[PDB]
Amino acid sequence: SHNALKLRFPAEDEFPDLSAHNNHMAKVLTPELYAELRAKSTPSGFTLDDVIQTGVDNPGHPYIMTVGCVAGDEESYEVFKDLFDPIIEDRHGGYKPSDEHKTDLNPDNLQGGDDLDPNYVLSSRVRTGRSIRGFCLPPHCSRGERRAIEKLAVEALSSLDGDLAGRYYALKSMTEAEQQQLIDDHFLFDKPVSPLLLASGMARDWPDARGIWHNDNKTFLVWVNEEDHLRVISMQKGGNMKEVFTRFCTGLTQIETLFKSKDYEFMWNPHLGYILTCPSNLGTGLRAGVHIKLPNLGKHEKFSEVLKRLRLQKRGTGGVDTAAVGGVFDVSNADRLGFSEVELVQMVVDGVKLLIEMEQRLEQGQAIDDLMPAQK
Amino acid sequence: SHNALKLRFPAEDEFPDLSAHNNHMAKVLTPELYAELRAKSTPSGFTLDDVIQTGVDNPGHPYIMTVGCVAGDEESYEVFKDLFDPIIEDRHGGYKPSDEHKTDLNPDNLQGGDDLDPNYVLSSRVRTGRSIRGFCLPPHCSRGERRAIEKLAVEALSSLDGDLAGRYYALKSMTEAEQQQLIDDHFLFDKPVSPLLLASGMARDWPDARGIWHNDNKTFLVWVNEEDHLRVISMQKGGNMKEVFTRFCTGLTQIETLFKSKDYEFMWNPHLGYILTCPSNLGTGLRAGVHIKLPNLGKHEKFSEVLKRLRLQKRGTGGVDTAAVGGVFDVSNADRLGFSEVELVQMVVDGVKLLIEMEQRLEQGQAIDDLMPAQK
Ligand SMILES: Nc1ncnc2c1ncn2[C@@H]1O[C@H](COP(=O)(O)OP(=O)(O)O)[C@@H](O)[C@H]1O
Ligand SMILES: [Mg+2]
Known about the structure:
- Chains A, B: Residues 6-93 form the Phosphagen kinase N-terminal domain.
- Chains A, B: It catalyses: creatine + ATP = N-phosphocreatine + ADP + H(+).
- The structure is a homodimer of 376-residue chains.
- With 376 residues, chain A is an alpha+beta fold.
- The first copy, chain A, folds into two domains: 1-97, ATP:guanido phosphotransferase, N-terminal domain (Transferase Creatine Kinase, Chain A, domain 1, Orthogonal Bundle); 100-375, 2-Layer Sandwich (Creatine Kinase, Chain A, domain 2).
- Chain A contains 13 helices and ten strands.
- In chain A, strands 2-3-4-5-1-8-10-9 form an eight-stranded antiparallel β-sheet.
- Chain A is globular, with a radius of gyration of 21 Å.
- Chain A starts with a helix and ends in a 17-residue tail after the last helix.
- At the A-B interface, helix 8, strand 2 and helix 11 of A face loops of B.
- Residues 123, 125, 127, 186, 235, 287, 289-291, 315, 318-320, 330 of chain A line the site of adenosine-5'-diphosphate.
């Protein structure tokens, strides 16, 4: 046993140096908490050192605040709750250990959002992730488990029909140009270059058992075995978020149904909602957003604050690990736990509209300056 | 006695609540049939409540309907025929109570099948199950009966020689080395984890009297006292399905002959063929299939349809085989009752050969429409 060897050393000699680190894990992990949890392990053998490695290796990130830790299996969140609970509370605006997560996958509860200004919104996307109970998560899953997961996913998705009928495209089976085309077109996950993906062990055996399934129009897609067992995605050009979300809920429900038929269930509990690798993706694990052109807003003052006020996050055109190019920003809901899928999409819709108005505060004749403070 | 107690309650007080159930048993068990059959029992004491317990415990799924009942002895099918007959008819595509099942274990009747293209067929296999008359089935057999069955099996199997010379491995005394080898060879079975099997009572006293026997060449395998008294499997790499089926037939014949010399025989009758625990396994209880490479066809939208038309079904795989090929499948006959063992193996042989033709067409980037078969 390796952990057994490490346990021969006093806890202080193994405690990581997080002095110049800026991630959620670093903000919570103390010498005391490390000494208390370093001897524990989940049934699959995942340990605290495994949980925090990415956060030790990556002091920060150039575009967003990172969590700095991952779960290796469903039991990770329980065995190491004294580490995860505070992180979750911080990352998800005060979500406490005693709080409950609520789901709402009914499109009808989303007001408007069916016509975000086309001149500003180039495309709308809604995604989430799901883990199959009984298997270890990507940071820890063996080649055998990953292949088993791929087998089940492929089997299940082959049942989707109608507008959701599609095909599975194994990473290994596509040419270099085919892969890059899908990536650049915003459909497929990038090559394993993410500092998180690398340091957490999620890039092992790449591209074995990884792939993408999608319908003919590429408006509904499922990533298999990338950062999570499954990443369910609904997307299309334009700003009809309502339509995107409706298709999302429909396909997501049909997928769970298919899995249940085979007696498989997604990792889920009343407190954390759906369980995923990264604590930031718990609850709904939902990220709804748009590629929005705001060449001046992205430059304007306190833009970072307007997004913070609306619980929104910004990413590059190529995603979280990229910068915005041509003034096109990736704007989506920053929160995922403590709000329902419907409430989340509603925040993006309402937030975008504002961003647009704030976007039109110069080309015509206006600008924030008068009615602003007076916080109430 | 206990049944006498229940008979003191009105039938509707003992009637199971199958409001949210989706299994064959639930479909046919009306309040009237329950009241008509709840007072009956077989000579071994098996009652209707015993027959349907697993179906009451396991609701099944709308999309995938389970059987929901089991036979506890040979008489169960007769005593509770008013339950089983409709279930059998529905499950086996219209097999009527008056239909006859023809058994054909003569390899000479199989046309060809000795040359399935080895560039596609990685291995061939034929599996079945048998029950020994005079003993209750797994859900109901006592420790004594189970041990008696094991002793008979071990004795007969130890008599096999030459190509069928083998060794017996009791689960009880199994070492770590033996189980790992058995695991690597895909020969091991463990205590069931399926609630459908557990709820029937078939896993009692595990692993008492359970065992694994296989010949030295590892082309003939027998499981003792698992789902049924005996599960017989013949296999080998390549596409010589005729050879596999021939070994299958010879092994079964010799075993049966050894049993007869001791005044024992397999449960069998002109209507249901070989009697087994689950109604879905009646008739031949045979599954003949191939591990086959079909990377192109496997991605074709008409793949599931072609298999359906050929009266075949598939299962994806999770090994290095499909990983390297990008599509290896387990394809076998779908029918069990109303077709002889020969007709069933013939359908796999004929179907496979067409699948290979379609695969070769797709390799040439051609269409397979002209090869599409009509439902048979
Ligand atoms: N609103 C959007 N419209 C079109 N593509 C998008 C949108 N948001 C993100 N993407 C695509 O998703 C990728 C980045 O995904 P991130 O890494 O941002 O996904 P994460 O949302 O997985 O769950 C990028 O390559 C980009 O092409
Ligand atoms: Mg991503």
